[PDB]
Scaffold this active site. Structure first.
Site, PDB file in Angstrom:
ATOM      1  N   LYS A  61      -8.156  -4.943  -2.867  1.00 50.92           N
ATOM      2  CA  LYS A  61      -9.180  -3.984  -3.244  1.00 50.92           C
ATOM      3  C   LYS A  61     -10.562  -4.577  -2.979  1.00 50.92           C
ATOM      4  O   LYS A  61     -10.767  -5.751  -3.189  1.00 50.92           O
ATOM      5  CB  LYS A  61      -9.035  -3.595  -4.702  1.00 50.92           C
ATOM      6  CG  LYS A  61      -7.736  -2.841  -4.992  1.00 50.92           C
ATOM      7  CD  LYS A  61      -7.497  -1.746  -3.969  1.00 50.92           C
ATOM      8  CE  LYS A  61      -6.866  -0.546  -4.608  1.00 50.92           C
ATOM      9  NZ  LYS A  61      -6.516   0.461  -3.601  1.00 50.92           N
ATOM     10  N   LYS A  85       0.828   9.037   0.809  1.00 49.28           N
ATOM     11  CA  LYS A  85       1.198   9.194  -0.605  1.00 49.28           C
ATOM     12  C   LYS A  85       1.688  10.586  -0.783  1.00 49.28           C
ATOM     13  O   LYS A  85       0.932  11.547  -0.680  1.00 49.28           O
ATOM     14  CB  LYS A  85       0.011   9.002  -1.535  1.00 49.28           C
ATOM     15  CG  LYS A  85      -0.467   7.567  -1.608  1.00 49.28           C
ATOM     16  CD  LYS A  85      -1.760   7.488  -2.361  1.00 49.28           C
ATOM     17  CE  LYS A  85      -2.257   6.050  -2.423  1.00 49.28           C
ATOM     18  NZ  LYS A  85      -3.667   6.082  -2.909  1.00 49.28           N
TER      19      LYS A  85
HETATM   20  C1  LIG Z   1      -1.469   0.907  -4.908  1.00 47.32           C
HETATM   21  C2  LIG Z   1      -2.908   0.513  -4.798  1.00 47.32           C
HETATM   22  O1  LIG Z   1      -3.303  -0.633  -4.632  1.00 47.32           O
HETATM   23  N1  LIG Z   1      -3.785   1.426  -4.999  1.00 47.32           N
HETATM   24  C3  LIG Z   1      -3.680   2.834  -5.078  1.00 47.32           C
HETATM   25  C4  LIG Z   1      -4.643   3.291  -6.201  1.00 47.32           C
HETATM   26  C5  LIG Z   1      -4.093   3.082  -7.476  1.00 47.32           C
HETATM   27  C6  LIG Z   1      -4.244   4.086  -8.393  1.00 47.32           C
HETATM   28  C7  LIG Z   1      -3.705   3.946  -9.660  1.00 47.32           C
HETATM   29  C8  LIG Z   1      -3.039   2.804 -10.048  1.00 47.32           C
HETATM   30  C9  LIG Z   1      -2.516   2.700 -11.322  1.00 47.32           C
HETATM   31  C10 LIG Z   1      -1.847   1.572 -11.716  1.00 47.32           C
HETATM   32  C11 LIG Z   1      -1.691   0.546 -10.821  1.00 47.32           C
HETATM   33  C12 LIG Z   1      -2.231   0.657  -9.545  1.00 47.32           C
HETATM   34  C13 LIG Z   1      -2.911   1.795  -9.151  1.00 47.32           C
HETATM   35  C14 LIG Z   1      -3.433   1.924  -7.878  1.00 47.32           C
HETATM   36  C15 LIG Z   1      -4.346   3.185  -3.695  1.00 47.32           C
HETATM   37  O2  LIG Z   1      -3.915   2.676  -2.622  1.00 47.32           O
HETATM   38  O3  LIG Z   1      -5.383   3.864  -3.735  1.00 47.32           O
HETATM   39 MG   LIG Z   2      -5.700   3.408  -0.895  1.00 48.69          MG
END
Ligand SMILES: CC(=O)N[C@@H](Cc1ccc2ccccc2c1)C(=O)O
Ligand SMILES: [Mg+2]
Ligand SMILES: CC(=O)N[C@@H](Cc1ccc2ccccc2c1)C(=O)O
Ligand SMILES: [Mg+2]
Lengths: 368, 367
Positions: free
Chosen positions: B163, B263
């Site tokens: 992130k 997703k």
């Molecule tokens: C899987 C990843 O790194 N992120 C998700 C966002 C996301 C959203 C909600 C979450 C709740 C709990 C744990 C991780 C979470 C990740 C994404 O790609 O955007």
């Molecule tokens: Mg993402």
């Protein structure tokens, strides 16, 4: 200034006549109003969400919810508030534009009332009145449509827009052109009811000299509209797709649109609506003012907006009595096909409390 | 089949460790589950909305509301129901994709359980197991990040995703590359936190050989991404912008994207996700499976999805114990960096009632 609190009203107003659209028939308008309270004084906002998510994803219960639990609290928590600062204070929350717009409207009306300044003056009005058109629903029969249209023409409306849908497009237009002639300003609106595969059918509108066809395809299908524009002669106008000034710039660069409908609520407020107006103007793209059956509060703000320089086509800001026997404000009355721009501070109008109360179905206060 | 009714549950599950993203920190996952009941039997759906509208416009209370008052009634009113027919039955309602996707999931699990067919089989699986990566949050300090990453690498995860956010991008990546070397599969995800004016800063990532940068700009700014791709060397991947198969086709035609995160919830269901997979495949665009901290129910459907042929990059479908000490289903356990594809009918997993109950905060029946 600091926001003391906001009052949320639900309100329900019967329509003089039921109004049919490609996404359904509507007999009564249920809507949300907002009364923002500051130390200085009050202002009013209107939400243009409908009962259910049939025009866009937002609807009354959902807007009320996001307002109550997210948007209003985030404004109550701020040290200083301006209409302009609303946007960044609410930016962390995705979407909910019609809701944000309503709340911005209320804050703006308060701010401007306190400076004794009109919506017109803030937005950049250059005119005292604006020419008005009317939107006519889908009808059960052609002769019924022709009577309604002739009626709105006799009242002196300057342009006619017809709602359309597969099954009701070429015939209604042909009929209106045979009866009322080629000089009437005439346009159509599908509210997303076609796909690109329907191009030959929409091309059948070529010979009738329409000003435009509004949102033939779904909200997200901008590229589709640009394809469609290569296959028909009627200019494309977008409504649902134009959710922001950026989205307008994008649709213009892609050749998806030649004329834009501005609905303030749809774009997240009167301030973003001004931006849409200016972006379109910088690209040579005419705009006109959309309508979501607003009460006199929103109608007043819309008339002010429609008085900006690049609104060069008649809008859908019809007179109050086109929708409501009894408006909750001083009503808007057509005069020589035009509506006059409000002159007082803020909206330049306010609800008449006896009339508002008749028509209110719920009321709640959100404070500190 | 005729839908008898649907049960809506609000559940709450603590995370092994808080998870920080460009839109905020999360300690606990609140989520919606759906138990669809038919004469034949039951199926389960999971909604990937979060507590508030910070990742997208949908959130748990809002999804519950649109499910209760619009989506579920419109299915209850139909004479005949199929997973496939869910979409047209719900088409008059705009948006609410995560909600629709959860409902479709539940109907689909039921339908497939009745034909003794797995999610894998219905979707077109070609593999028994799938390589899994992990997503790592924003940390308070670089050395704290490096420990977490080294940990996940020791557990045998095949790829690392970080992130990122203005203030936390080039340094974390540089540090991970200095410590763990150039052979690690490495990528980043901004969850919309930059604008096009930040291009020079994202160009600062050029030298670190990242697989991709995910959603650097806002959801609606597709053209912006295509501009950005002309100014940086890291491939663009989109997540939030890819709301449908059509939106994927559009972004690809515009050169706004080279790799796509699927997703299912975000695109309105597992069926539309399969379409996104096939569209991307027809354009030579690799996909990988995204993750929203699902329970074992959604994780099981996702692992099945990730076993389709064009999932050629490791996904975010990490093991259950990456998020939860105690999953509400048989947990998913990493084994040689992979997770195995469920074999039973439907999801191939179901909640253990004793586990589900400990963690349920509310429950309502819509009939
Ligand atoms: C899987 C990843 O790194 N992120 C998700 C966002 C996301 C959203 C909600 C979450 C709740 C709990 C744990 C991780 C979470 C990740 C994404 O790609 O955007
Ligand atoms: Mg993402
Ligand atoms: C002005 C026009 O023809 N239509 C709006 C849609 C709309 C939406 C909600 C309404 C509620 C009550 C009355 C009319 C309404 C029209 C639009 O242009 O799409
Ligand atoms: Mg319209």
């Amino acid at each position: 200034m600091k926001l003391s609190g906001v009052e949320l009203r639900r309100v329900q107003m019967p329509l003089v006549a039921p109004f049919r659209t490609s996404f359904g028939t509507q007999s009564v308008r249920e809507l949300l109003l907002l009364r923002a309270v500051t130390p200085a004084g009050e202002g009013w906002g209107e939400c243009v969400t409908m009962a259910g998510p049939l025009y866009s994803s937002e609807y009354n219960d959902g807007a009320e919810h996001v307002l109550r639990h997210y948007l209003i609290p985030a404004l109550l928590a701020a040290e200083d508030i301006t209409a302009a600062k609303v946007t960044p204070l609410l930016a962390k929350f995705k979407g909910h534009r019609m809701a944000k717009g309503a709340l911005e409207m209320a804050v703006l009306d308060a701010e401007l009332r306190a400076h004794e300044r009109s919506f017109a003056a803030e937005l950049g009005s250059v005119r005292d009145s604006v020419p008005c058109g009317v939107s006519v629903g889908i009808m059960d029969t052609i002769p019924q449509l022709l009577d309604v249209v002739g009626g709105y023409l006799d009242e002196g409306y300057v342009r006619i827009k017809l709602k359309i849908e597969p099954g009701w497009d070429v015939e209604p237009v042909r009929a209106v052109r045979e009866r009322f002639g080629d000089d009437v300003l005439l346009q159509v609106d599908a509210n997303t009811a076609y796909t690109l595969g329907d191009a030959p059918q929409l091309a059948r509108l070529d010979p009738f000299g329409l000003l435009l066809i509004e949102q033939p395809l779904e909200e997200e299908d901008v590229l589709g509209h640009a394809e469609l524009a290569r296959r028909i002669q009627t200019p494309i106008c977008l409504d649902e797709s134009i959710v922001s000034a950026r989205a307008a710039a994008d649709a213009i660069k892609l050749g998806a649109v030649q004329i834009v409908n501005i609905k303030p609520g749809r774009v997240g407020g009167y301030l973003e609506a001004r931006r849409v107006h200016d972006v379109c103007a910088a690209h040579g793209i005419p705009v006109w003012c959309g309508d979501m059956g607003e009460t006199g509060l929103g109608r007043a703000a819309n008339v002010a907006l429609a008085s900006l320089p690049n609104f060069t086509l008649p809008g859908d800001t019809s007179a109050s009595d086109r929708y409501y026997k009894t408006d909750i404000t001083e009503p808007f009355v057509l005069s020589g096909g035009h509506l006059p721009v409000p002159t007082g501070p803020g909206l330049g109008v306010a609800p008449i409390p006896e009339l508002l109360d008749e028509v209110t179905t719920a009321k709640v206060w959100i404070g500190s």
